[PDB]
Amino acid sequence: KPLVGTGMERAVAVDSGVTAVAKRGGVVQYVDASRIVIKVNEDEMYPGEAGIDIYNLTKYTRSNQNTCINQMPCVSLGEPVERGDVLADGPSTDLGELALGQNMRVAFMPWNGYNFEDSILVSERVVQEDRFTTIHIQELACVSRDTKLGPEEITADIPNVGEAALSKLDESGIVYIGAEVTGGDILVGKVTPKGETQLTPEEKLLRAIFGEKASDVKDSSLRVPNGVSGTVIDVQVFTRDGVEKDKRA
C-alpha cells in the first residue's frame, strides 16, 4: 500500500485485468483460497437462470517474465459487495489498489562509504521480514523425440547413477511434486540408445540372423540448471495420440 500515492492506483488495478472484479454485486456465500462464490442481489439479478457468481481464482503460476502471478481473496465470509468491486487482489495489488514495492524507513546521509555513487545500504530488518523476498518460476521441458536406433525411454533405469538421483524419482522416472531440488539433480530421467557402433552390412546380416540386440544406453535426463534451487510445484505430461501412456501419465 504506497503511502504516497496519486489516486490513479485504483484505475490501473481495476482496468488491467489482473484482479477479479465482480460482474454482478451481491453477498459472499463462500470464500476459499481458490474460488469465491457470491450470491447475487435481487435488482441486479435475472428472473430465469437463478444464478450465483463463481470466480475461480488463478493461483501460483508462471508469468511471461518468469515471475509469479497469484490472486488472493480480499473479502471476508458473508460480506456485502457491490457491482464493479474487486474480489481478489492479484499480483502487486493491495485491497484493490496498486502496490509494486514496499514502503520503508529511509534516511538520507552518508554512512561510512557503503552508499558511494548510487549504492543503497539496507538493514537486516528488511531481509528478516521477508519483505522483498519474491517468487520466481522456471518452466523446464523434456521432449522425447523419435530418433535412430529406436526412440528414447523416460524410464528410471539410468546408467552410471545410483539411488543418489533415483531417491527423488518415482516408479515412472518423473520427479514428485514437492521435491526440494538443488542444482545438479535429475528431474526427468531420459535414456538414449547409445553404442553408436555403425556395424557393417555383414555384421548387420549377422545380428539379423543370429538375433542379438545392442542394449547399450546413455543418460540424457532433464537435469536442474546450475545455481538454481526450489520446489517442483507442477508437472504436466503431454503425449501423442499414437503413443501408449506410462503410469504417472
Binding site: 463462500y30 470464500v31 476459499d32 483460497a33 481458490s34 493461483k59 501460483y60 497469484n70 488472493m72 481473496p73 465470509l77 537486516e124 528478516q128 521477508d130 517468487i135 514428485y176 511434486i177 514437492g178 521435491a179 526440494e180 534451487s229 520446489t231 517442483v232 510445484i233
Partner: protein, 221 residues
C-alpha cells in the same frame, strides 16, 4: 574509586515492553554501557521461534488447501510471527487441530504445559467451511540470531525462516541521577521492547554475562 551500578527498577509498563533502570553510574559510563547493552540485547538473545511446519494434507508450501482462505505460504508467515516460550527443552513439536468455521487462533494449539503460548489472540489463518479442518505439527526449537532456510539446509516437512530474536526495539536514555547527596551521576534507563518470552532482568543479565565473557577473553576473573 569508581561507583558501580545496580538494577534498581523494572517497570512492567505492558505485556510486550518494559523499562529497566541502571543506577548509579559514573559520568561517562552511561552512554558506554547503554550502547553496549543495546548492541548485545539486539544481537544475541536466545529466542524460541518456529522452525519447521508440517501440515497434513499439503505437499509443498506453494499450494492451496480446500477449505481455508489463506494460502499455505501466508500460514507460514503467520507462524513466523509467533512468539512462544519453552522452558525445559531445546526443541519441541507443537500440534494444532481445529475444524469448523472460525479464525484459527494460536490458542487452539495443544498446550504441552511447559510450552507457553505468550499471545493467544494471534491468528494463524481462517477456516472457512464446516467440514474443513487443518492439522499441523509445528516444530519449534531454541536458537540465537537469524538463521534463514538456505543456510542450515521427506517432502512434507515445510521450512520457515527462523527469526530467533525476542527483542524488537531497544531505547536507552541517560539522565542525571540526583542522589547520594552528590551531583554528576548518570542514570541509565533502557526501554526494551519484547515479543513476550523474555524477562527484561534476564535480558540485561544475559547481556552483561556476554560482555563479561568477551572481556574474559584477555583479563583474569
Amino acid at each position: 574509586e569508581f561507583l558501580k551500578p545496580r538494577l534498581v527498577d523494572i517497570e512492567q509498563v505492558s505485556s510486550t515492553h518494559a523499562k529497566v533502570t541502571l543506577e548509579p553510574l559514573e559520568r561517562g559510563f552511561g552512554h558506554t554501557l547503554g550502547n553496549a547493552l543495546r548492541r548485545i540485547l539486539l544481537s544475541s538473545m536466545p529466542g524460541c521461534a518456529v522452525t519447521e511446519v508440517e501440515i497434513d494434507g499439503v505437499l509443498h508450501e506453494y499450494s492451496t488447501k480446500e477449505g481455508v482462505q489463506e494460502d499455505i505460504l501466508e500460514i507460514l508467515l503467520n507462524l513466523k510471527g509467533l512468539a512462544v516460550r519453552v522452558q525445559g527443552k531445546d526443541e519441541v513439536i507443537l500440534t494444532l487441530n481445529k475444524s469448523g468455521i472460525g479464525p484459527v487462533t494460536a490458542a487452539d494449539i495443544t498446550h504441552d504445559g511447559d510450552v507457553e503460548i505468550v499471545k493467544p489472540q494471534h491468528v494463524i489463518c481462517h477456516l472457512t467451511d464446516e467440514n474443513a479442518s487443518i492439522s499441523m505439527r509445528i516444530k519449534v526449537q531454541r536458537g540465537r540470531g537469524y538463521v534463514p532456510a538456505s543456510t542450515r539446509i521427506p517432502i512434507g516437512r515445510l521450512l520457515v525462516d527462523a527469526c530467533y530474536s525476542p527483542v524488537e526495539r531497544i531505547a536507552y536514555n541517560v539522565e542525571a541521577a540526583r542522589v547520594e547527596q552528590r551531583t554528576d551521576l548518570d542514570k541509565l534507563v533502557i526501554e526494551m521492547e519484547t515479543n513476550g518470552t523474555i524477562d527484561p532482568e534476564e535480558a540485561i543479565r544475559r547481556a552483561a554475562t556476554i560482555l563479561a565473557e568477551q572481556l574474559e577473553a584477555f583479563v583474569d576473573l
